[PDB]
Ligand binder design. Structure first.
Ligand SMILES: *[C@@H]1O[C@H](CO)[C@@H](O[C@@H]2O[C@H](CO)[C@@H](O[C@@H]3O[C@H](CO)[C@@H](O)[C@H](O[C@H]4O[C@H](CO)[C@@H](O)[C@H](O)[C@@H]4O[C@@H]4O[C@H](CO)[C@@H](O)[C@H](O)[C@H]4NC(C)=O)[C@@H]3O)[C@H](O)[C@H]2NC(C)=O)[C@H](O)[C@H]1NC(C)=O
Ligand SMILES: *[C@@H]1O[C@H](CO)[C@@H](O[C@@H]2O[C@H](CO)[C@@H](O[C@@H]3O[C@H](CO)[C@@H](O)[C@H](O[C@H]4O[C@H](CO)[C@@H](O)[C@H](O)[C@@H]4O[C@@H]4O[C@H](CO)[C@@H](O)[C@H](O)[C@H]4NC(C)=O)[C@@H]3O)[C@H](O)[C@H]2NC(C)=O)[C@H](O)[C@H]1NC(C)=O
Ligand SMILES: *[C@@H]1O[C@H](CO[C@@H]2O[C@@H](C)[C@@H](O)[C@@H](O)[C@@H]2O)[C@@H](O[C@@H]2O[C@H](CO)[C@@H](O[C@@H]3O[C@H](CO)[C@@H](O)[C@H](O[C@H]4O[C@H](CO)[C@@H](O)[C@H](O)[C@@H]4O)[C@@H]3O)[C@H](O)[C@H]2NC(C)=O)[C@H](O)[C@H]1NC(C)=O
Ligand SMILES: *[C@@H]1O[C@H](CO)[C@@H](O[C@@H]2O[C@H](CO)[C@@H](O[C@@H]3O[C@H](CO[C@H]4O[C@H](CO)[C@@H](O)[C@H](O)[C@@H]4O)[C@@H](O)[C@H](O)[C@@H]3O)[C@H](O)[C@H]2NC(C)=O)[C@H](O)[C@H]1NC(C)=O
Ligand SMILES: *[C@@H]1O[C@H](CO[C@@H]2O[C@@H](C)[C@@H](O)[C@@H](O)[C@@H]2O)[C@@H](O[C@@H]2O[C@H](CO)[C@@H](O[C@@H]3O[C@H](CO)[C@@H](O)[C@H](O)[C@@H]3O)[C@H](O)[C@H]2NC(C)=O)[C@H](O)[C@H]1NC(C)=O
Ligand SMILES: CC(C)CCC[C@@H](C)[C@H]1CC[C@H]2[C@@H]3CC=C4C[C@@H](O)CC[C@]4(C)[C@H]3CC[C@]12C
Lengths: 52, 439, 439
């Protein structure tokens, strides 16, 4: 699981790989209100429910 | 002119600042921290290594009892055993058969291998942070290496740089550390002269070549087997070897904030913690007056593409009509979006293209091209890839920023419901006013 | 047996501690701090010294205008003066009467004296304390040296000592210090690369052998004076020399707590601040059983003379029944009185004499010898000398809880006033009971 701050993974003797998530989602930020809330929930799943 | 700014400590992400000197054309400086090194100052506590049990040949008194004398040797242990009848290859050692005694002695010396295979127990106090900074100054890439304690002045191309003091004093090293080869460990080693057998630091010495040796290995001599001349002993095995087989994970694999731990000298590199104040004294020769810089009028912004992909996904095309040929520094007027280009050459009536990175659902922002501003609005789409191998170039955004047409919607909803509330308030107020007229 | 105690961090004042092991004769240990050293860990910021101005011979061009280029010398300054008509000993040097030019160039480099006469600007982070302690152990007087950071357990005569850690981290050195030869100054020297002319650090270098010199002396060339071949210059004098003539008092004379300061390495010897924990692991062989130690009876105390001054102004004589011949420790049962001697030989029915110091006007104390106690009473006279040149040997001044004798005046006054108040209260209570007893 890659958190927001990023994940560093060392595999054997290889140089470590670094991964960061980006704002990917299956919703849309300019469509119907339910698509809106789906996008706005998928990006920030914790405090979107709080604000809603 | 002295310009003071603050940049996050993250390594490899350039940040751009607007030096705005009234009476002169705006200047844009892009600075990127290529390497930040925290080198703690180490006071060596001691050196641990593998011990060696020195056992000289036992003495065998054929008819009589042998006795020994105490010695100052690091772990000297002697014992006399009675009623031994040892045998050599040719038969019994000597005539007297039951009165024979064996004097057996042993001690512990730090091995010669302590010169090369050893662990150093150090104490660390404070870090003298240093930074390598890449600055896009006057269109050229310059590199300044400066101590980040706020007290080093580096002058390049007549421009003076003061770096530091770093906001956060956090370091991955605690007070007491252990260094072995290229690995650094954070452990509370036992105090000097009070080591424990079979664990780390059972044998201790201040320096690898020091002749004094504190060793605690529980060297206890045992009775030799009947008919043999060997010297048996019960001893806790070298704690250095047990630590080596059970080291665990080093700091470079467990340090927080993604710090890279190195040795010779001990360094912590690229810790993305806190931020860095940077003060730049820029000479007058680097500035251009507003009347000599181009004047841009009748400019408009269009956004052919925008995706918040953390890799400068948005593109802006701006039409301008320049007063005369020249160069001018393009800078974003908001913190939510960042422009890759620092300056653009402009000439006549034309269009210029810039690439920007953002996290906004709708990229509504303003761009200050030369001394004027142009407003851009965009319909931005999410990227299809979930994971990338580089940190986001755009900045984190607040509550109101991401809201876009959802904000347009909550405007309608709040307006309607608050209108209902206002109508109710008006009805209540008029009813109260009428009520007070009836007394 | 582990005994932990605390002694004030003063030098030259012995302290008595009582090791009381049940089933064993009490032991007393006298500990005295001979030297407490605070050694800060220094990272050399830079080196300053006296600069030397190098001026090549001026270039006199007769019938043409001389021109010079910029050079990367530390403070290179170059100028051309027109209309010069220089003279040598044999007459005019330049035939062309006018239009002659003189090219004058000069620069600054650190002089050779920087290898001997220099001031080192250091940064101080944290001191690693060390302590030398004299212990009165088993009638012998031994000396033990150990770091005072709660570490470096040191074994002498099988007795294991752990010194510290210091109760206070106070150090006389600020963050930045300047060391010249043997005087260290708490000076906030200018940051490297940002020196100022005519002050400390106008010329700076990282290490005495470094070729990297940053010099800021505002060296300005002036016009030659009317037919001479010299090259004048107006330059701020060496700020290092001005600092030398204006050093003031060093930390050796201005530090509080009576700290002494030494260099090579930099130490703060004998700082009387805070206190010191001491842990002692006494071997079992050290102690003597109660049955073998003498048991004293018929023990009484008297005081031939007492002077409540320093240096043990009181003398006491105690009579005992020694029972078996032997020796045992002598201890004070109260802190306000301190007995000089630690152990005494008792034999037969003789009497022993002890020396004690106190700030008490009325000595009221108890003395423990060979596990049995006596009460000593004395009236102590004030000393005649107003000032002595050694620290007070008694523990401290009295507190409100401990007055002198003839405090019975206070008892009598309090008793009389309280008795009047109490009889008044009894009368009031009786009257109130009568009043409430009506009807
Ligand atoms: C194979 O490779 C390994 C890895 O490099 C080698 O190990 C190296 O061995 C060297 C030789 O011993 C080590 O170098 C020095 O050895 C000195 C021997 O006396 C030792 O004294 C040194 O330690 C001091 O200097 C260090 C650097 O300045 C300090 O960090 C250290 O704290 C010591 O400094 C003293 O500290 C006390 C603290 O109380 C102060 O009071 C003193 O004033 C300080 N004095 C000075 C002068 O500063 C140092 O160890 C080298 O360290 C070691 N490698 C590592 C990583 O530790 C093997 O030797 C090699 N194989 C062969 C065959 O050579
Ligand atoms: C006349 O007499 C004076 C004194 O009365 C003499 O001055 C002494 O000169 C010596 C040699 O010049 C000095 O000894 C060393 O000189 C080294 C020259 O390279 C210098 O580098 C040394 O300093 C480093 O090493 C020390 C021990 O290893 C460290 O304690 C010290 O802090 C320095 O260590 C690093 O230095 C670099 C420098 O850039 C820093 O970046 C690091 O951070 C430092 N690390 C640490 C862990 O500290 C050392 O000075 C000697 O010091 C000096 N005397 C005094 C009191 O300073 C003259 O030589 C003499 N002249 C003649 C002709 O006799
Ligand atoms: C423990 O160690 C001391 C010697 O150690 C030395 O002194 C320590 C204080 C310390 O600094 C050490 O680093 C240092 O090496 C042993 O003896 C102490 O010193 C003298 C030795 O002769 C003892 O007797 C003294 O002798 C003086 C000369 O005859 C005499 O004048 C002293 O009495 C009078 O002196 C002062 C003047 O300075 C005077 O004003 C006073 O009125 C005082 O009576 C003194 O008797 C000391 O008694 C010893 N020190 C103490 C504090 O008692 C000591 O013997 C040893 N322990 C054992 C068990 O042997
Ligand atoms: C947007 O929609 C996408 C498609 O609807 C989502 O992708 C799907 O996401 C789910 C859960 O997030 C995945 O389900 C998991 O599947 C794995 C195994 O599937 C993978 O491995 C097999 C191996 O043969 C491979 O054939 C598949 O194609 C997958 O690559 C299970 O082990 C898990 O338990 C779990 O069921 C889907 O696999 C995944 N499909 C695809 C095509 O991506 C996407 O997650 C959505 N995004 C968001 C933000 O919701
Ligand atoms: C000033 O320096 C920046 C970045 O610093 C550079 O980075 C190093 C990796 C070296 O290249 C050094 O020269 C220098 O320290 C320069 O920006 C970078 O320019 C390079 C090439 O001009 C870009 O590489 C390309 O990137 C694209 C991205 O899609 C790839 O497709 C290409 O294949 C190629 O790799 C690089 O992306 C770019 N980075 C940034 C952050 O802009 C800059 O050009 C330079 N300017 C001057 C005047 O020297
Ligand atoms: C009412 C319906 C139609 C739309 C409401 C959408 C709201 C609830 C959505 C819009 C997208 C969301 C925000 C977009 C950006 C930010 C800033 C970030 O630092 C924390 C999450 C936060 C604060 C999100 C929380 C929830 C959010 C505000």
């Amino acid at each position: 699981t890659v958190p927001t701050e990023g994940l560093e993974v060392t595999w054997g003797n290889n140089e470590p790989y670094k991964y960061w998530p980006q704002l990917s989602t299956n919703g849309t930020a300019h469509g119907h209100p339910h698509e809106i809330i789906l996008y706005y929930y998928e990006l920030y799943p914790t405090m979107t429910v709080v604000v809603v | 002119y002295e310009h003071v700014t603050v940049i996050p400590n993250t390594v490899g992400v350039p940040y751009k600042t607007l030096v705005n000197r009234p009476g002169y054309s705006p200047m844009v400086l892009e600075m990127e921290l290529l390497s930040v090194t925290l080198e703690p100052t180490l006071s060596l506590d001691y050196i641990t290594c593998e011990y060696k049990t020195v056992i000289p040949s036992p003495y065998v008194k054929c008819c009589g009892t042998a006795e020994c004398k105490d010695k100052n040797l690091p772990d000297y242990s002697c014992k006399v055993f009675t009623g031994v009848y040892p045998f050599m290859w040719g038969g019994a050692y000597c005539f007297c058969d039951a009165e024979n005694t064996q004097l057996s002695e042993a001690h512990v010396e730090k091995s010669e291998s302590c010169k090369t295979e050893f662990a150093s127990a150090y104490r660390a106090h404070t870090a003298s942070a240093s930074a390598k900074l890449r600055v896009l100054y006057q269109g050229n890439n310059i590199t300044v290496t400066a101590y980040a304690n706020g007290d080093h002045a580096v002058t390049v191309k007549d421009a003076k740089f003061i770096v530091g003091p770093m906001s956060s004093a956090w370091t991955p090293f605690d007070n007491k550390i252990v260094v072995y080869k290229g690995d650094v460990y954070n452990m509370d080693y036992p105090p000097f002269g009070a080591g424990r057998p079979g664990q780390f630091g059972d044998i201790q010495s201040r320096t690898p070549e020091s002749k004094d040796v504190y060793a605690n290995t529980q060297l206890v001599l045992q009775r030799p087997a009947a008919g043999t001349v060997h010297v048996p002993y019960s001893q806790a095995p070298s704690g250095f070897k047990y630590w080596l087989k059970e080291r665990g994970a080093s700091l470079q694999h467990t340090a927080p904030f993604g710090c890279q731990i190195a040795t010779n000298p001990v360094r912590a590199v690229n810790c993305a913690v806190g931020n860095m104040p940077i003060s730049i004294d820029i000479p007058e020769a680097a500035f251009t007056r507003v009347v000599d810089a181009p004047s841009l009028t009748d400019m408009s912004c269009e956004v052919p593409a925008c995706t918040h992909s953390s890799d400068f996904g948005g593109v802006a095309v701006i039409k301008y009509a320049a007063s005369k040929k020249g160069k001018c520094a393009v800078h974003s007027m908001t913190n939510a979006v960042t422009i890759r280009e620092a300056e653009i050459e402009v000439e006549g009536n034309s269009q210029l293209q810039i690439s920007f990175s953002t996290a906004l659902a709708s990229a509504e922002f303003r761009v200050q091209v030369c001394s004027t501003q142009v407003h851009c609005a965009a319909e931005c789409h999410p990227p299809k890839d979930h994971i990338v191998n580089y940190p986001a170039s755009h900045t984190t955004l607040g509550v109101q920023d991401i809201s876009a047409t959802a904000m347009s919607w909550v405007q309608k909803i709040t307006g309607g419901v608050g209108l209902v509330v206002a109508v109710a308030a008006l009805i209540l107020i008029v009813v109260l006013c009428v009520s007070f007229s009836r007394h």
